[PDB]
């Protein structure tokens, strides 16, 4: 009964869920109403974060702490980061369906000690999520941003371009938080998003700026990361 045509979301969901069970021992339940993550592309981003935050010798090994902005119903970045690397995550969500599924997915995989799923107000991002945080420095923030039109026949094109305004909000919050987080990062869907974002960091005098390209056959993605550390 499960479709063999990989253009059908039922086949993409079955493949994601099977891959996670077989390769990572992670059993997840996700709705067809929400974005279905593709594991290879999610892994590329986790590995890029490993490289950014640096390697530790046994004597200097610590618990790494990260924030996932918009964790989705799958809670895919925290589930992978926690399972593969033992990383701690603060995983945020504004969507109620996504929040319930993410919380349930963390519980069914007994990862509540490493992943804290939180429902945040729609107007909030990083600043509010870290309300009066003065005990720890987070190693990273990561984000697969939503496609909001403004926040018609060209609604899709408009929604895709809404990625730029969402990343600009992460940049805005980073200018206030600064060294509270070591690396700020975001995944980009369009190559044309990179140039205006790099320029916005340059004019704001952000000392460290880096970027990469993730490729999974047909699908091409970019990621941008920045830091206030010298
Ligand atoms: N301000 C905000 N804070 C937290 N989550 C937000 C948000 N605005 C939107 N979101 C959520 O961000 C998500 C973007 S889709 C990315 C889902 C997941 N990280 C993946 O890679 O598959 C959506 O689930 C949306 O509800």
Numbering used by the authors: 41 to 191, 213 to 291
Describing publication, verbatim:
To our surprise, even though the ΔN-truncated version (40–291 aa) has a similar conformation in terms of the Rossmann fold and catalytic residues, it was inactive. The complexed byproduct of the SAM-dependent methylation reaction, S-adenosyl homocysteine (SAH), is coordinated by a hydrogen bond interaction network with the highly conserved amino acid residues R82, D108, G110, T111, S114, E133, Q162, N184, and R230. While 20 residues between Q191 and T212 are not visible in the ΔN structure, a much larger region (35 residues) between F187 and G223 lacks density in the core structure. Third, the ΔN structure reveals the presence of two sulfate ions (SO42-), one of which is next to R82 (one of the residues coordinating SAH), likely mimicking how an RNA substrate might access the catalytic pocket. Given that the METTL16-ΔN domain is inactive as an MTase, we examined whether it can bind RNA substrates using UV crosslinking experiments. Incubation of METTL16-FL with a body-labeled MAT2A hp 1 RNA gave an RNA-protein crosslink consistent with RNA binding, while the ΔN version did not reveal such an interaction. This aligns with the observed lack of methylation activity of the ΔN protein when the same RNA substrate was used.
METTL16 is the second m6A methyltransferase identified, and its known substrates include U6 snRNA and the human MAT2A mRNA that encodes for S-adenosylmethionine (SAM) synthetase (Pendleton et al., 2017). In contrast, we show here that METTL16 is active as a monomer, and it contains a large deep-cut groove that can accommodate structured RNAs.
